[PDB]
Design an enzyme around this catalytic site. Sequence first.
Site, PDB file in Angstrom:
ATOM      1  N   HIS A  75       0.831  -1.208   0.000  1.00 61.56           N
ATOM      2  CA  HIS A  75       0.000   0.000   0.000  1.00 61.56           C
ATOM      3  C   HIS A  75       0.857   1.246   0.000  1.00 61.56           C
ATOM      4  O   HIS A  75       0.967   1.975   0.996  1.00 61.56           O
ATOM      5  CB  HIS A  75      -0.991   0.025   1.167  1.00 61.56           C
ATOM      6  CG  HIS A  75      -2.012  -1.066   1.114  1.00 61.56           C
ATOM      7  ND1 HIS A  75      -1.874  -2.259   1.810  1.00 61.56           N
ATOM      8  CD2 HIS A  75      -3.199  -1.136   0.465  1.00 61.56           C
ATOM      9  CE1 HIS A  75      -2.928  -3.021   1.569  1.00 61.56           C
ATOM     10  NE2 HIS A  75      -3.753  -2.357   0.767  1.00 61.56           N
ATOM     11  N   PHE A  77       3.047   4.203  -2.978  1.00 60.87           N
ATOM     12  CA  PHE A  77       2.791   5.098  -4.097  1.00 60.87           C
ATOM     13  C   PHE A  77       2.708   4.369  -5.443  1.00 60.87           C
ATOM     14  O   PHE A  77       1.955   4.761  -6.327  1.00 60.87           O
ATOM     15  CB  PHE A  77       3.849   6.240  -4.156  1.00 60.87           C
ATOM     16  CG  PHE A  77       3.640   7.159  -5.314  1.00 60.87           C
ATOM     17  CD1 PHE A  77       2.509   7.964  -5.370  1.00 60.87           C
ATOM     18  CD2 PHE A  77       4.509   7.158  -6.383  1.00 60.87           C
ATOM     19  CE1 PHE A  77       2.254   8.781  -6.473  1.00 60.87           C
ATOM     20  CE2 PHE A  77       4.274   7.996  -7.475  1.00 60.87           C
ATOM     21  CZ  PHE A  77       3.130   8.792  -7.518  1.00 60.87           C
ATOM     22  N   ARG A  78       3.505   3.338  -5.632  1.00 60.43           N
ATOM     23  CA  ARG A  78       3.422   2.584  -6.880  1.00 60.43           C
ATOM     24  C   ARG A  78       2.026   1.944  -6.997  1.00 60.43           C
ATOM     25  O   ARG A  78       1.483   1.896  -8.085  1.00 60.43           O
ATOM     26  CB  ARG A  78       4.550   1.572  -7.008  1.00 60.43           C
ATOM     27  CG  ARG A  78       4.666   0.975  -8.396  1.00 60.43           C
ATOM     28  CD  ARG A  78       5.787  -0.075  -8.445  1.00 60.43           C
ATOM     29  NE  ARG A  78       7.035   0.517  -8.017  1.00 60.43           N
ATOM     30  CZ  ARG A  78       7.870   1.218  -8.789  1.00 60.43           C
ATOM     31  NH1 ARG A  78       7.671   1.403 -10.076  1.00 60.43           N
ATOM     32  NH2 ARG A  78       8.928   1.740  -8.247  1.00 60.43           N
ATOM     33  N   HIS A  79       1.417   1.538  -5.882  1.00 61.83           N
ATOM     34  CA  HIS A  79       0.056   1.021  -5.916  1.00 61.83           C
ATOM     35  C   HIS A  79      -0.980   2.079  -6.323  1.00 61.83           C
ATOM     36  O   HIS A  79      -1.849   1.830  -7.139  1.00 61.83           O
ATOM     37  CB  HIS A  79      -0.315   0.431  -4.555  1.00 61.83           C
ATOM     38  CG  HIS A  79      -1.754   0.075  -4.441  1.00 61.83           C
ATOM     39  ND1 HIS A  79      -2.352  -0.859  -5.262  1.00 61.83           N
ATOM     40  CD2 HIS A  79      -2.730   0.558  -3.637  1.00 61.83           C
ATOM     41  CE1 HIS A  79      -3.638  -0.940  -4.958  1.00 61.83           C
ATOM     42  NE2 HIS A  79      -3.890  -0.106  -3.965  1.00 61.83           N
ATOM     43  N   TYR A 247       0.381  -8.841   4.850  1.00 57.59           N
ATOM     44  CA  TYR A 247      -0.473  -9.778   5.566  1.00 57.59           C
ATOM     45  C   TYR A 247       0.281 -10.530   6.650  1.00 57.59           C
ATOM     46  O   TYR A 247      -0.212 -10.704   7.766  1.00 57.59           O
ATOM     47  CB  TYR A 247      -1.080 -10.793   4.585  1.00 57.59           C
ATOM     48  CG  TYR A 247      -2.275 -10.302   3.770  1.00 57.59           C
ATOM     49  CD1 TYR A 247      -2.641  -8.957   3.757  1.00 57.59           C
ATOM     50  CD2 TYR A 247      -3.033 -11.195   3.006  1.00 57.59           C
ATOM     51  CE1 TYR A 247      -3.737  -8.519   3.044  1.00 57.59           C
ATOM     52  CE2 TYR A 247      -4.146 -10.753   2.286  1.00 57.59           C
ATOM     53  CZ  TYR A 247      -4.479  -9.419   2.320  1.00 57.59           C
ATOM     54  OH  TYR A 247      -5.548  -8.949   1.613  1.00 57.59           O
ATOM     55  N   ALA A 275      -4.037 -17.962  -2.156  1.00 58.50           N
ATOM     56  CA  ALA A 275      -4.466 -16.574  -2.033  1.00 58.50           C
ATOM     57  C   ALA A 275      -5.141 -16.035  -3.325  1.00 58.50           C
ATOM     58  O   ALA A 275      -6.174 -15.341  -3.258  1.00 58.50           O
ATOM     59  CB  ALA A 275      -3.267 -15.650  -1.690  1.00 58.50           C
TER      60      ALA A 275
END
Length: 328
Positions: A75, A77-79, A247, A275
């Site tokens: 989570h 900046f690239r996200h 996670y 997942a």
Amino acid sequence: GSHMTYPKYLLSPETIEALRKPTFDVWLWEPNEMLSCLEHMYHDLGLVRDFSINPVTLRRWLFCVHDNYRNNPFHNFRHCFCVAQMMYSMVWLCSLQEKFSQTDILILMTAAICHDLDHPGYNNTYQINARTELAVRYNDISPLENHHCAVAFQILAEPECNIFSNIPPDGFKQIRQGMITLILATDMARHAEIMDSFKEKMENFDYSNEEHMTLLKMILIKCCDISNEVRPMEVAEPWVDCLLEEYFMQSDREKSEGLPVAPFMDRDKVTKATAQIGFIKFVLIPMFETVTKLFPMVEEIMLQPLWESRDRYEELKRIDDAMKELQK
Ligand SMILES: Nc1nc2c(ncn2[C@@H]2O[C@H](COP(=O)(O)O)[C@@H](O)[C@H]2O)c(=O)[nH]1
Ligand SMILES: [Mg+2]
Ligand SMILES: [Mn+2]
């Protein structure tokens, strides 16, 4: 392929073309290059023009957004860049400028960019269970998404970053309400509720119905947020390891503090393959299937990669399982 070399923050004509497609390799770029990409989208979508956005203020605003993303595994900046770039891609793929006002495009883009601001790297369940200052502040009601949205408007209240300074007050209120709705809609605890309401509207969808359009915008931002597996495998795959890093960091903390651990974050139970198979089969494919009813071109460009990813993760799981048949 130009007569001289230009600095990286000056995007090449080839990069600009590539940016319009969901195949864009998000890993190739430094933050300053990504900031230039985002800047270009605002100009190219005609938002600078139609909202009289000061071009320098656009740049300071983006620099400030960047600064307020944390260096989390996922989570980060690239996200935010991935989510925005997928939104931009969907604008072109689904011909959204034929369907939506410029105000709606502005809301979609600005919300995408701002939707994970100042994310702590531990989710709402951690905030609630640990009784964090965030959970207390927001009364256990989507604490993180409320926070993201509040930081969004704290940044926009700084005058040197106020990209909306030339929009009349009624315009501002419309944009603000729309962005809040969209960012709050990214809370996955509401996924099934939001999907249910949308599918209800889809029984007889109406582009001139404001409630129908709000729901569609909520689906769009949700699609972009969780869209990593739509990307080419080589771009998608590294994101999974980043998410599991977050996670596992959380479930370790929960065990250590004596808090509940979700089985889907458990180091002992979870694999990359397990997942993603469920997430792709039961969250991503059904959501994109409903969108494809409005936008049939979504099937080839976004559903096909998801089918392929599902398939490849099933293969992986078979070899992961066999590997575990050796290591006990
Ligand atoms: N299992 C899995 N979950 C995802 C993936 N992408 C997004 N998500 C989930 O959907 C949530 C979307 O909210 P976000 O925190 O990204 O705003 C994420 O927190 C994450 O738990 C993915 O590729 N695989
Ligand atoms: Mg979020
Ligand atoms: Mn996100």
